[PDB]
Design a protein around this ligand. Sequence first.
Ligand SMILES: [Mg+2]
Ligand SMILES: [Mg+2]
Ligand SMILES: [Mg+2]
Ligand SMILES: [Mg+2]
Ligand SMILES: [Mg+2]
Ligand SMILES: [Mg+2]
Ligand SMILES: [Mg+2]
Ligand SMILES: [Mg+2]
Ligand SMILES: [Mg+2]
Ligand SMILES: [Mg+2]
Ligand SMILES: [Mg+2]
Ligand SMILES: [Mg+2]
Lengths: 50, 77, 66, 136, 116, 177, 75
Amino acid sequence: GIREKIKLVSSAGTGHFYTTTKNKRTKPEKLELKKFDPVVRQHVIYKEAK
Amino acid sequence: STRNGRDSEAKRLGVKRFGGESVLAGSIIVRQRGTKFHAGANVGCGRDHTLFAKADGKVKFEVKGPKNRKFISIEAE
Amino acid sequence: MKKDIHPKYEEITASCSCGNVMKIRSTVGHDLNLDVCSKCHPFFTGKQRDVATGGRVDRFNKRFNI
Amino acid sequence: MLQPKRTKFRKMHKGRNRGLAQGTDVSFGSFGLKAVGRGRLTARQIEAARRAMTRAVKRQGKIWIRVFPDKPITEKPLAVRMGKGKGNVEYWVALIQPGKVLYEMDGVPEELAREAFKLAAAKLPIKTTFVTKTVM
Amino acid sequence: DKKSARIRRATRARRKLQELGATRLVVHRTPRHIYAQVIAPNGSEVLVAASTVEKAIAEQLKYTGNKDAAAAVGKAVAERALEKGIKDVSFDRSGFQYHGRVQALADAAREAGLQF
Amino acid sequence: AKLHDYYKDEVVKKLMTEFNYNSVMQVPRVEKITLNMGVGEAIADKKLLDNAAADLAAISGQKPLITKARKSVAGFKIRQGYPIGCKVTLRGERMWEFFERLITIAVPRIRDFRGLSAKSFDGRGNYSMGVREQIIFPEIDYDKVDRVRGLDITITTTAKSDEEGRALLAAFDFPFR
Amino acid sequence: ELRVYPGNYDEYMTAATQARERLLADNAKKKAQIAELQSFVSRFSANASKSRQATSRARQIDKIKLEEVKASSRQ
RNA sequence: CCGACUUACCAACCCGAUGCAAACUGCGAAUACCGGAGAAUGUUAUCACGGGAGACACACGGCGGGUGCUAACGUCCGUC
RNA sequence: UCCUCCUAAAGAGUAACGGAGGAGCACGAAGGUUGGCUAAUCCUGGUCGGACAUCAGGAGGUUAGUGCAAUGGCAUAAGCCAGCUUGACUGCGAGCGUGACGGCGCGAGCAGGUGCGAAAGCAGGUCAUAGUGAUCCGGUGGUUCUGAAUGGAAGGGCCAUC
RNA sequence: UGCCUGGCGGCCGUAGCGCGGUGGUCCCACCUGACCCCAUGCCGAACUCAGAAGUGAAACGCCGUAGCGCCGAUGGUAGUGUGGGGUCUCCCCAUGCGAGAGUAGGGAACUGCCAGGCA
RNA sequence: CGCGGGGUUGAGCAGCCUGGUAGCUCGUCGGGCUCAUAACCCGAAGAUCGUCGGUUCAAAUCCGGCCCCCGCAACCA
Ligand SMILES: [Mg+2]
Ligand SMILES: [Mg+2]
Ligand SMILES: [Mg+2]
Ligand SMILES: [Mg+2]
Ligand SMILES: [Mg+2]
Ligand SMILES: [Mg+2]
Ligand SMILES: [Mg+2]
Ligand SMILES: [Mg+2]
Ligand SMILES: [Mg+2]
Ligand SMILES: [Mg+2]
Ligand SMILES: [Mg+2]
Ligand SMILES: [Mg+2]
């Protein structure tokens, strides 16, 4: 409800994304996490964009 | 009067394999809510504190510990 | 200590107004001159000098010039 | 009228009344009124049977009441069908088993207590008996 | 109690090595000496033990109970253990921080063929 | 320092012959000095706590630790985690230096000084004292300060009784009654 | 949001004030037409001959859904 | 002002004794249930797959109870 | 509709318009790991300061605490701090538990790539149990799997997701 | 072979608490110093390093003590399976199982693998 | 003891409308004007926002519990 839904789009070029939830009113700031990207088979950085 | 009449579905807890039973690896022994029986030898502890076998054998309940805590252990016999 | 979160600390000469040289470490930045220490404090010499607030019959008698 | 203050739960199950009582001895006083029957004994039958024996001994002597109701008994209103919730609490009763020492008293000659306990046993539904302190 | 806190500081690390069933090399340290013994996964019987109180170790050492003395007993326990065929042990700590004499006790034993 | 080796050379012998001990270290020794104040009025003026911390840093050569409320109490409208007081623990050389510089100059500078009480022990040889104002200490210039905030000195010794604590503190020329 | 009114300024004022007092009026027309429906539902509810009628508008009360009033940014 | 004298008073925490609890437990059965072995007895009485159904309004009695008034040929469960 | 205790008769389950309370969430740290620590409440002493703020000793010992109701649990802490971080990761899964089914749940281990630690090791979200709705119909991103003469394309399919 | 001390367990209060005494040749503890490796949301108090002047005060171990904690019968009592019975909202009989509390009493542990000192 | 609406100064009322100023009209008091009272002019006084707790730095406002008052309902053969 209050926690909106966001997707972390991979930064390896391929189209892949993990979907989570983020409290969208504390301050606007994208999530940066290093998560596995199966298409390229490596641990890359995941910036968020819905 | 009124403002009542609610309950939840029974969770089917309790001991599934009593003492002396031959279990296969990975078979649930007890489904718990807390940790009433602790993990002894050759048994695990899931995220619900479910105690599961880790190598096939005969179950055995024990009371090891300074605090007299129930321990479930398995002998590969 | 924990490497510069503290103030400075150094030896400063703290002597009385009646001699009494006393080298004491402190954090002031300048030597200081003060009153007597407990060595020359007026504590055991004014025990009755402090308890003197009183006397009316004595000052009435001197008024009795007649 | 004896009744608990700040009880944990408002309404209680009916339950059953089987067995023999625990407080079967005269400990605080010297002469007691031991119960012989069985059945709940309410909070008004305690006060009505107490006044009757704090008055038959004038006002002298000590009197101990060794029971307390602590049991809420509900009662459905009149012209109300069944169901639609448990009834509301109306009075408090103290479950009595054969052997319970209900009242006891001290500081009086025996024949005065043996008559004061007779005027209190007439306000109680259950049978009673007069018992005396013993050495044990 | 300065010792009861330490004995309950290492309980979690100690009781995992009973569950894993792995031979452990417990370490005891004192302001004067330092001991090190190899204890079977049974936990009730020992196999190899070396310490700074033995006359064959402390006789050629300046002072027992410092880093270079710890390296003198860490060498000893590794030769005795390898002599009986024990090679794969795990390092206990007994609550001491892995920073000082214990580190040189472990580092020296590690360099002498012991694997952990 | 001076008070420490004075203790070593003289007080050990004096107390040993006074109490007829049998061991060198059966004589009580002072183990720490704690200087604190719970400012209380830092509910709304957090700068007051910083000023008090600066005062304590000036008085004793350490950075004070800011102490927060352990349990929420509704009487003083505070809750858990509110910075309330400041505290400084002195051990060893600094403890002895502050011990010298308190009872040699700061106590004499007390307005209308009469004497410290002797029945102010907690029953285990510990001493406590309230200076009631921070201006007396030589580390203060009487003009930088803005309030009347006072410390709470606590001398913690290894004495086994208030009697032995009294004896130890009177061996150091304390201004008792 | 950005709402555009064709007008110089004195048409905009009489548009954006009239269209707000109209919002309040069309909301009071619901807030006061729920009130007497609730009076009926509260009076003839347990009555056996009019309960089927009270329950007919006790459900049209909750299908009205008055429109909310926001807060002006000017203070 | 300090409390300086007082109070036919109420009274927490602890100490000794006496009771009560479905939603209390520092104790704790009888039965019941799960697993192993062993005789004897039972026209496999056990399980799996497949063809065909009916039934899903139950009643009373004994024991353990909830509701009721420990009332009802009352009502709702467990087992026979 | 879902969660917790009793009724529920010491395995599981067990009804009533029976007795009592909660949910439609929160968190990018309140998760992972490594290192460290132990509470409530009373006594004395003390400056403002009082029955209750902060400080020092003593008793006490988990009567405290757990993001949220109750039950079970917790000192090796599952409670309280700090450093580094993203395992709140992808494909699978022996074997089990619970459902009439739809489904739900526990899970050692295997492969590829990570985090913490010196290392043994731990990490597939949080002390556990609530915080949630099938199918159809459509929206978005990726993939020549298909493409109604052939090459494309529209449209379908598969994976992620609303 | 016996005594003492240290480490790691089995075992878990008959094993813990309190009170009195006792131990420093070795081990252990307190302890000296701190610039150093390392740390204090301040403080070498804790953690850590460099050593030996001193002490056995504190702590710990050992010995004695029942003032507590703890263990705990036999007999009786309650309850209950099966089968009968009663004046059957509660009980009795036959038979099998048999508590809880309490009483008499027990009791301030026992033990294993290593490494030191002493005889 | 089932459902709603309210408690703000001596009286009648807002502000609660998404939290940051205790206000309106009558009224009370002290002066002035008048021969005197009213009217009028000047100055001022008060309340624990029912009570008790809760997140919030801050509550009349948001939340929970209790008290008081005023209304409504408690059906038909
Ligand atoms: Mg049907
Ligand atoms: Mg049916
Ligand atoms: Mg039926
Ligand atoms: Mg019937
Ligand atoms: Mg059950
Ligand atoms: Mg059963
Ligand atoms: Mg958590
Ligand atoms: Mg940890
Ligand atoms: Mg955690
Ligand atoms: Mg939780
Ligand atoms: Mg084509
Ligand atoms: Mg396509």
